[PDB]
Design a protein around this ligand. Structure first.
Ligand SMILES: *[C@@H]1O[C@H](CO)[C@@H](O[C@@H]2O[C@H](CO)[C@@H](O)[C@H](O)[C@H]2NC(C)=O)[C@H](O)[C@H]1NC(C)=O
Ligand SMILES: *[C@@H]1O[C@H](CO)[C@@H](O[C@@H]2O[C@H](CO)[C@@H](O)[C@H](O)[C@H]2NC(C)=O)[C@H](O)[C@H]1NC(C)=O
Ligand SMILES: *[C@@H]1O[C@H](CO)[C@@H](O[C@@H]2O[C@H](CO)[C@@H](O)[C@H](O)[C@H]2NC(C)=O)[C@H](O)[C@H]1NC(C)=O
Ligand SMILES: *[C@@H]1O[C@H](CO)[C@@H](O)[C@H](O)[C@H]1NC(C)=O
Ligand SMILES: *[C@@H]1O[C@H](CO)[C@@H](O)[C@H](O)[C@H]1NC(C)=O
Lengths: 104, 466, 103, 469
């Protein structure tokens, strides 16, 4: 079949990856193709289940890399990172921006 | 010799058939030629019949008098007509059967008195009607059954007493009517009947007790040994007793829906080799599967809304020829083999408590079309469970806590339903599944695997839903 | 409106008949047109309900007029009429044909 | 080519925030690293390169390294000073290897490290404070490993942490204060474990915790330890073995938004259990056989979807919708409802499912002023009478299911323009119906075929109409 892929089909690409690879589903317009990477490309976060390891697009506005849904990890440069989610302001609880923009 | 404004034509040679319907008459004409074997007077606003009527038409085989406003009929109005085979008097305003006018018409076969305002049937006003086999007393104001007037009708074969106000049937009420084949009593108010109220009619084949006010099962049914078709739906019965229909083998159709049934004895439907369909919804008190000894020709069996915990392992020995099985809304956990129940086309075991589907649980069902196991707790399905089902096209496994999925068999169904199975994260390809046109998937990314201001064109191929 | 009809529409013909008339639905291919008679023409039987009076087609083998479903009233001439249902033989119980075919 | 590093062979490389050089030496089927790796390297990807030792001669001295990748490389242990020279390392990746335990020292003192990946190994032991001196660590991955207990002591040295996952392991117990020092923690994932027991104070530490994953585990009773988590936003404990949710279960957790307890063999829920969660969106409860009364939702008006099925609810309060504006979906199927309230206050309702109940009548005010209502299902009920003006004020209504009921008639007032109508099972329903009154109809099911027929069935750009006897 393919690379790091234990079950393929030309129509859909790979369907099941190696015991410890992530499946990346690529939306090449009206069609869907799956691949098997060891880390998910920028914009996606790694998701592990017993049955399937999925790369998941990180639906957080103005974010770059992420730990999961609803928790961002390296926010957009130009925006501040306070406890997962990103803000222009940010606490003022015990934080505020200093040298690098990582809302202490 | 045919009246004015009426249309007319010959009979079996010579004799003349007359249609003088809705001309809005006031009275008949005497212009009526003899040789009349057919006289249609209808909707013609006739009051009296009459100061100067016309018997003397010894050839009349059929007279119609519908839609003409009458209240009573002269005792000698029909005297001269000896050849009368059918009389029609429906849709008038008789408040009682003609006290005499109708007795002794030995040729009369069919008599219509429906859609009037009659509330009283004079004792044997039907006397000497030894050829009458069809009586219509529909849409009237009766309050009791004319037992005595009926006693003079051993000729009768078909009778309707529907849409009245009868509320009781006393013993032997239809007692001498032994030639009667069809009795219709629907849309009355019968709340009570005797232990022996249908003891007379030996020949009766169908019995309609629908749309009435019965509180208990009609046990009087037991003597009806040749009954073929029974209805007592839309009543108020609360249960069906053990060995209910023992007295009626060769029964074919039974109808008791819209009835607040709670329990049915498991014996009740024994020994009816002629029954085809059985249906039982909302029977909360039913705890075990009905015994169906001597009734193997069931084509359809539905029993829902009960507490059936388990099926016998040999359930399908009395169910060949079965085509649909519906045991939805029960407490089934463990399932039998169902293989012996061939000719099965639909199976509905939804909203139950099944946890496992083995290899043999549906094997060798070559005619199976639809299988629904939705809203269950099915965790394990043997991978080859569906391997031998050529006819399978619809499958509902929604809400079931599955984690994997069998691709052997079912290699070309058309309806697939898997939503509610959260652990079902596995992916699937379009090949394996031609003929698929409707799908529902636990997760959208799986749906995607199937493709999912001027002109525009729909080009509908296939569906899916997250 | 029409004759004995208390509710019509050119698309569907009559929809509701007079208080004590029967509605006859005629299948003129892809369409259905309703009329209001006091009796149903040969082939149909009169059925009275509180809500609606319909003329009903009599799907009984080889029969002309009928009392209802499963009960024929004047079986086809050439076949015997025994108690509702018509057959070629017939009892032999207390019947058999004489002059006219009325077992 | 005014400035071009300075990068090893067969590897791809590109500049960073000026000068500093990003290196990709992934899957080359390498054996060990090369030297001559230039400095100014701020990114080094070594992955899938089948390396055993790290190394006889490794390479620190790369004080500009911002991110090291070592995934897919068959390792077992790491030299105690392998990462010493890397002063600016902010993220280290060591997933998909074969460590059977965390490097006892090798990871200690890395003051710049923010993200540590140790998932997809075979580790079953975490040496006491192998995380010592990591005051900048905020993301820890210990997924898909063979842990059996919480590394309490090692976590005690992680007051910096913000996000941690211990998923796909074998943890079966959480002792009190197990995560006691992780007060900066926001996200905790414990799914796909084997937790059968936990203490009353097993979550007393993390004051900052916002989401908590207890899914796919073996809990037999409700986690009451949840009570101290006053900043919880998102809770999951589905696919367990819980049998009930106690009264005032989520009292300690206002500002909760999403709760997930499906695939749980639930039987009873306390009527108070869901009080005072103004921020909750959805509530769903199937197969709760023992529930007899409607849940109290005081201080929780922002529900958008509410479903409660498979219970013994005999009747609703006359004031249900005073706690339920903003509701959009209501599913109360499979209950014992006979009498219904007014629903008028429950605006913004778009779909209603009250099938398989024992309703006998639909009054005038039972659905008044529901301007957003689209689909209404009252199938498999015992509805005999419908008030003529019951559906009068329903502009958006397009789907109506009245199957299996006790109808004889029907209101034509209002609703003269739906698209789905279902009336089969209504035997007394013998009346005829016309195409006029009902444009836009495309799907119908009729008690009797002759009625279907009145709609033709035995541009045109819409399609053909349906009907069924
Ligand atoms: C409708 O029936 C009435 C009977 O109620 C007819 O009334 C009679 O009409 C004649 C004239 O045609 C009068 O001489 C009688 O005195 C009327 N009798 C009664 C009792 O009213 C009436 O003619 C009929 N009308 C139509 C249009 O058919
Ligand atoms: C009821 O049925 C008829 C009355 O309609 C009676 O039958 C009569 O029987 C005698 C001999 O037994 C015949 O000679 C008569 O011709 C029959 N009359 C008719 C009209 O068929 C029968 O006896 C009655 N049964 C009972 C129990 O009273
Ligand atoms: C790695 O080895 C190379 C050898 O090429 C060193 O790079 C340069 O090598 C050329 C000859 O090929 C010399 O003329 C330059 O003077 C070298 N440059 C430098 C900066 O020394 C390179 O330095 C070596 N790097 C390391 C880290 O050992
Ligand atoms: C590592 O991979 C190489 C080929 O890339 C292979 O020849 C070698 O055997 C592998 N190592 C082991 C332990 O087999
Ligand atoms: C957490 O552990 C650190 C050790 O680095 C210690 O200094 C600190 O006091 C601990 N925090 C709490 C709340 O105990």
């Amino acid at each position: 079949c393919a690379k790091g892929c234990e079950l393929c089909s030309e129509v859909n690409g790979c369907l099941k990856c190696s015991p410890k690879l992530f499946i990346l589903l690529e939306r090449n317009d009206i069609r869907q193709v799956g691949v098997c990477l060891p880390s998910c490309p920028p914009g996606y976060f790694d998701a592990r289940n017993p049955d399937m390891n999925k790369c998941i697009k990180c639906k957080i506005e103005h974010c770059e890399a992420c730990f999961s849904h609803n928790f961002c990890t390296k926010c957009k440069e130009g925006l501040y990172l306070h406890k997962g989610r990103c803000y222009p302001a940010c606490p003022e609880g015990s934080s505020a921006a200093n040298g690098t923009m990582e809302c202490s | 010799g045919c009246p004015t404004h009426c249309h007319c034509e010959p009979d079996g040679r010579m004799l003349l058939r007359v249609d003088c319907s809705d001309l809005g008459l006031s009275e008949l004409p005497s212009n009526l030629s003899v040789f009349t074997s057919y006289l249609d007077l209808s909707m013609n606003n006739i009051s009296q019949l009459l100061p100067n009527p016309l018997p003397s038409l010894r050839f009349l085989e059929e007279l119609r008098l519908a839609g003409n406003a009458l209240t009573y009929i002269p005792k000698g109005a029909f005297t001269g007509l000896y050849s009368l085979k059918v009389l029609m008097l429906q849709n008038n305003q008789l408040r009682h059967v003609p006290t005499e006018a109708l007795q002794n018409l030995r040729s009369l076969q069919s008599l219509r008195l429906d859609a009037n305002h009659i509330s009283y049937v004079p004792p044997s006003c039907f006397s000497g009607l030894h050829s009458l086999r069809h009586l219509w007393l529909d849409d009237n104001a009766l309050t009791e059954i004319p037992v005595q007037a009926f006693r003079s009708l051993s000729a009768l074969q078909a009778m309707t007493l529907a849409l009245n106000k009868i509320h009781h049937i006393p013993d032997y009420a239809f007692g001498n009517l032994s030639s009667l084949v069809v009795l219709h009593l629907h849309n009355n108010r019968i709340h009570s009947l005797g232990k022996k109220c249908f003891d007379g009619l030996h020949s009766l084949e169908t019995l309609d007790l629908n749309y009435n006010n019965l509180d208990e099962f009609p046990t009087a049914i037991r003597t009806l040994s040749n009954l073929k078709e029974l209805g007592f739906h839309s009543n108020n019965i609360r249960s069906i007793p053990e060995k209910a229909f023992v007295g009626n083998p060769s029964l074919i159709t039974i109808h008791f829906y819209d009835n607040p049934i709670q329990f049915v004895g498991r014996s009740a439907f024994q020994h009816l080799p002629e029954l085809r369909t059985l249906t039982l919804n909302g029977a909360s008190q039913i705890t075990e599967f009905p015994d169906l000894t001597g009734t193997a020709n069931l084509e359809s069996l539905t029993l829902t809304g009960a507490q059936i915990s388990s099926l016998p392992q040999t359930v399908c020995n009395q169910l060949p020829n079965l085509q649909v099985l519906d045991l939805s809304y029960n407490l089934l956990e463990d399932l039998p083999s169902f293989s012996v129940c061939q000719k099965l086309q639909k199976i509905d075991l939804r909203h139950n408590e099944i946890y496992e589907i083995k290899v043999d649980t549906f094997q060798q069902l070559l005619s199976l079309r639809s299988l629904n196991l939705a809203w269950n707790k099915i965790a394990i399905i043997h991978p080859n469970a569906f391997s031998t089902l050529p006819s399978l096209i619809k499958l509902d496994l929604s809400s079931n806590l599955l984690s994997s999925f069998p691709i052997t068999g079912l290699h070309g169904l058309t309806h697939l339903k898997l939503t509610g199975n959260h652990a079902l994260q596995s992916l699937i390809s379009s090949e394996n599944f031609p003929e698929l046109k409707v799908i529902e998937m636990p997760y959208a990314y799986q749906c995607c695997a199937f493709g999912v201001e001027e002109d525009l064109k729909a080009l509908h191929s296939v569906q899916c839903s997250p």
